[PDB]
Ligand binder design. Structure first.
Ligand SMILES: [Mg+2]
Ligand SMILES: [Mg+2]
Ligand SMILES: [Mg+2]
Ligand SMILES: [Mg+2]
Ligand SMILES: [Mg+2]
Ligand SMILES: [Mg+2]
Ligand SMILES: [Mg+2]
Ligand SMILES: [Mg+2]
Ligand SMILES: [Mg+2]
Ligand SMILES: [Mg+2]
Ligand SMILES: [Mg+2]
Ligand SMILES: [Mg+2]
Ligand SMILES: [Mg+2]
Ligand SMILES: [Mg+2]
Ligand SMILES: [Mg+2]
Ligand SMILES: [Mg+2]
Ligand SMILES: [Mg+2]
Ligand SMILES: [Mg+2]
Ligand SMILES: [Mg+2]
Ligand SMILES: [Mg+2]
Ligand SMILES: [Mg+2]
Ligand SMILES: [Mg+2]
Ligand SMILES: [Mg+2]
Ligand SMILES: [Mg+2]
Ligand SMILES: [Mg+2]
Ligand SMILES: [Mg+2]
Ligand SMILES: [Mg+2]
Ligand SMILES: [Mg+2]
Ligand SMILES: [Mg+2]
Ligand SMILES: [Mg+2]
Lengths: 65, 102, 61, 89
RNA sequence: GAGCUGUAAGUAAGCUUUGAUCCAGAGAUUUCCGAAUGGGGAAACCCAGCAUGAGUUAUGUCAUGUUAUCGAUAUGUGAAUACAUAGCAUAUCAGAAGGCACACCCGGAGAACUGAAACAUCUUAGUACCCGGAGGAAGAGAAAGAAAAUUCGAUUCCCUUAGUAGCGGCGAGCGAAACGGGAAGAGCCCAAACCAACAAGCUUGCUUGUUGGGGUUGUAGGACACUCUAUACGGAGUUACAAAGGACGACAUUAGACGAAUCAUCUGGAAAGAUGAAUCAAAGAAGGUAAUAAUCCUGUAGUCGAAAAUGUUGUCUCUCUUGAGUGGAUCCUGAGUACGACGGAGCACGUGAAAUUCCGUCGGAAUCUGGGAGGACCAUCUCCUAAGGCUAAAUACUCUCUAGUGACCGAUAGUGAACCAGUACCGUGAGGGAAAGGUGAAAAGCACCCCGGAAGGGGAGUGAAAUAGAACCUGAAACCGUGUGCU
RNA sequence: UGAGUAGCGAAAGACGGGUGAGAAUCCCGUCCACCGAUUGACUAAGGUUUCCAGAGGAAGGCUCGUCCGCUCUGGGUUAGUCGGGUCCUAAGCUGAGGCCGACAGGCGUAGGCGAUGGAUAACAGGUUGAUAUUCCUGUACCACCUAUAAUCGUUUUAAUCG
RNA sequence: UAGAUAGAAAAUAGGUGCCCGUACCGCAAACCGACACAGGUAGUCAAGAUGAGAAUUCUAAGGUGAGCGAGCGAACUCUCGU
């Protein structure tokens, strides 16, 4: 998910998306550990999604001040 | 590079000097290109690898980009390339005919 | 770190000289005396030189 | 933070014997304590934890070519379940 | 503007013209240690208080913030001791701390080997080292100057004076300055007299203190008295001379864009070489490309370009701000100062006939009819006006960035380090401190067969070359082998 | 070069059967021998993965090597009660204010830090290739928390804390 | 005791209890000695016969055969017996 859609989302939606993305990342890591993950690029994709979500959240809580 | 994937070029230096072919890959960081039918190498392929069958495989090796020259679309002569700006877009121009390469 | 509270008078360095002009380092110390004066409107015992005390220019209280 | 507390499961012969004993082995963040590990496992897998043992493993010297180095130090927790089960696969 | 997920090959999974990768400006994140600052500690660890929150029935657990010391400024309380003074407590502060560029600057403290053919005065040397303080420069600086003529007019720095004058167990050695020629230039503010307001002593005389005005000097100046001139007209300014801002513009820096002109044959693996015939040039700098290229590529001359940030600047704004003259009645013009003695030090000058300047100790002026200097000292003459402060430039240096240069090195050289080097290694530690570059144009890096467990080799093949096959360009000598003509 | 020379670092091995390209040297067996106030079992320092399993035989191993403390691959260390911290202090170190000192800094009070000492609750058995007072079985103990409580208290108190 | 406050708890039931170390060598081939080095390295346990004994000799529990060998059986050197 890109920064444009992230900015479309609302703050509560940003937090929920961060939670679900972190849960997905955890599941991906566990599959990788157990040897059940072939599509390894998903880990990096989700990591960058989380980074973008947090970036937009920080932008909002900065511009509020 | 002034030569681009898919371009039709003439080899102006090398064993294949005088041959014409299509550019099927470019290596910007090495200033090299791969041209169909140009610079064929015979590599020893082990059948024991992931490919069962083995032997001597013939394939094009990359050539230095300054050894190929674009062909003028009108005259079909090798030509250098300039650039024009048409409605704010860069256009490759053959310096011999003035046409647009692509 | 000893000097006159009033003027900053402090020790200096120089030479002791023999009759044959041999030289060794020595100090000239100030003639400091521990006196009670008014510091910031309150009594306080500080180091003051005899010369800074001379002619009653410092009030001892 | 539970998903940060737990890093990955450990799959070895000793760890498989433990799993037969209802003990699940994880690599965990090197800074967390036994209680945090217990709470993270209970939150993520919805189980009841009987106990947690924990241990540290030093960085291990490792060589590749002419370059000498070390593996990351590890913190390994062994969680004995009271109720429920964990399916790693 | 087409590829990309570093060195770094491989595989995998992916991204990208709906513009990746990549380049520049700005922003976000930025674990732990470290001045390290809640406390402790054997750095990168451990253990807490307080507030708020998460979680639990609750405890245990967790998250965020905060909590060092000193300094300064406020507030409360306040011992011996009455008043209040220590003290204590709370609050605020982009206050300090620590680092380094092994450079340059100022200062504190300060050797020795060495030279003197010994050595002590002297020298090395106010050097090395240590310590404090900086700044982008520092230091100095608007005459108590230099001088001795038609005098000059702050300071600094360069040339010269000059290895002169001098100093010196008159040994070794040390060694000016003025003048003259240059770089660069810039001049200012206080203290005091006096005036007004305020407060204490309450003569409630007018003394002291704070604030503001005034004033700033040698041609003596100022106060004071008087006469003109103006409330920003003018003038000045954040580089001193007072101190903060704002608007617009210009230029520059940090990515980039365009950018002329060559074909053929021979040799050769390959042409840029040779040969023949052309072309461009404000471009014949340079690097690369299969050998040596102005015209193949990247470039070069030239021209163009900035969303954003930064820097330097111009004009407006803003801010501040009177400027001259006459008079000599009175007043002011830097005090434990100048200066002297004793003891040191600094001055090129070693105490000397020793001025000129600083320190310790002790003594201790004058007040414009004053005071200082012209190398003891006195007189005369002349030049200055100390005991308060500020001040750009010309000067020094280079950790660093950008663009370049060299009758500088070319792998035992050049950095210690061309390479994963302050590494390996050595040492308790401070510290010492290496060796080590080159396949090929391209990896085309030797399919396959044979002997061998492998290593290694012989073919085959790639390649111009493998007698270029992996520390793989060339491959000297020492040294070690095999064969052999003569002996 | 010396030179195929000196040396190969205290000692008792023999044979059979395996393995393997290769065996005096590896594995297994029998017999023999050696230490046994110990060459045995723990354990503090110190070291820091050398530990276990599978694989290897270039180099290291003073020979050899099929083997190894070596090389490769993957593993292994579990605590309320054991030792240390969330307890105590000795020497010593440090040290707000403070005293002293050209600078740097030295000394030092309150206060801290600091075991080699004081205090302090778990034992037996079983188990792996590699850990075990740590895992498992059985049976305990210590501190704290929540609920229900025989009983006692209920503002000079009188139960309770201190 | 000074002080603090309505509330306290014998018992019963249930629950909570962190961080560091823990491998292995450790009179040694893993430590200090440049070495798989006849040296050095605190403490605990330590059986039988004999004996005063932790001496002595031989054994136990347990561990070990020592990381060059095979011959020969000169001088000489060393260690040992007469
Ligand atoms: Mg543990
Ligand atoms: Mg001499
Ligand atoms: Mg001499
Ligand atoms: Mg200055
Ligand atoms: Mg061109
Ligand atoms: Mg040609
Ligand atoms: Mg060549
Ligand atoms: Mg004197
Ligand atoms: Mg004088
Ligand atoms: Mg004279
Ligand atoms: Mg004059
Ligand atoms: Mg200057
Ligand atoms: Mg070198
Ligand atoms: Mg060479
Ligand atoms: Mg070198
Ligand atoms: Mg060659
Ligand atoms: Mg060679
Ligand atoms: Mg011999
Ligand atoms: Mg011999
Ligand atoms: Mg021998
Ligand atoms: Mg031996
Ligand atoms: Mg082993
Ligand atoms: Mg060997
Ligand atoms: Mg102090
Ligand atoms: Mg102890
Ligand atoms: Mg064991
Ligand atoms: Mg253990
Ligand atoms: Mg053990
Ligand atoms: Mg001993
Ligand atoms: Mg005995």
């Amino acid at each position: 998910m890109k920064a444009k859609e992230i900015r479309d989302l609302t703050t509560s939606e940003i937090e929920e998306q961060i939670k679900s993305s972190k849960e997905e990342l955890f599941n991906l890591r566990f599959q990788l550990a157990t040897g059940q993950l072939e599509e390894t690029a998903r880990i990096r994709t989700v990591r960058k999604t989380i980074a973008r979500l947090k970036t937009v959240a920080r932008e909002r809580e900065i511009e509020q001040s | 590079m002034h030569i681009k994937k898919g371009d039709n070029v003439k080899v102006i230096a090398g064993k294949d000097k005088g041959k014409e072919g299509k550019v099927i890959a470019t290596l910007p960081k090495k200033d090299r290109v791969v041209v169909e039918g140009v610079n064929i190498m015979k590599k020893h392929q082990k059948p024991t690898q992931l490919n069962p069958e083995g032997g001597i495989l013939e394939t094009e090796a990359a050539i230095h980009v300054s050894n190929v020259q674009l062909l003028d679309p009108k005259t079909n002569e090798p030509t250098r390339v300039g650039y024009k700006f048409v409605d704010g877009k860069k256009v490759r121009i053959a310096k011999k005919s003035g046409e647009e390469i692509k | 770190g000893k000097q006159c509270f009033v003027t900053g008078r402090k020790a200096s360095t120089g030479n002791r000289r023999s009759h044959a002009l041999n030289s060794t380092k020595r100090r000239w110390n100030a003639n400091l005396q521990k006196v009670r004066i008014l510091v910031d409107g309150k009594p306080k015992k500080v180091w003051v030189s005899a010369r800074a005390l001379k002619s009653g220019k410092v009030t001892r209280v | 933070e539970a998903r940060d507390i737990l890093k990955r499961p450990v799959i070895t012969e000793k760890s498989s014997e433990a799993m037969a004993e209802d003990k699940y082995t994880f690599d965990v963040d090197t800074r967390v304590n036994k209680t945090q590990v217990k709470m993270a496992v209970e939150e993520i897998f919805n189980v009841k934890v009987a106990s947690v043992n924990i241990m540290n493993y030093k960085p291990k010297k490792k060589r590749m070519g002419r370059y000498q180095g070390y593996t990351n130090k590890r913190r390994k927790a062994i969680v004995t379940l009271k109720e429920g089960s964990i399916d790693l696969f």
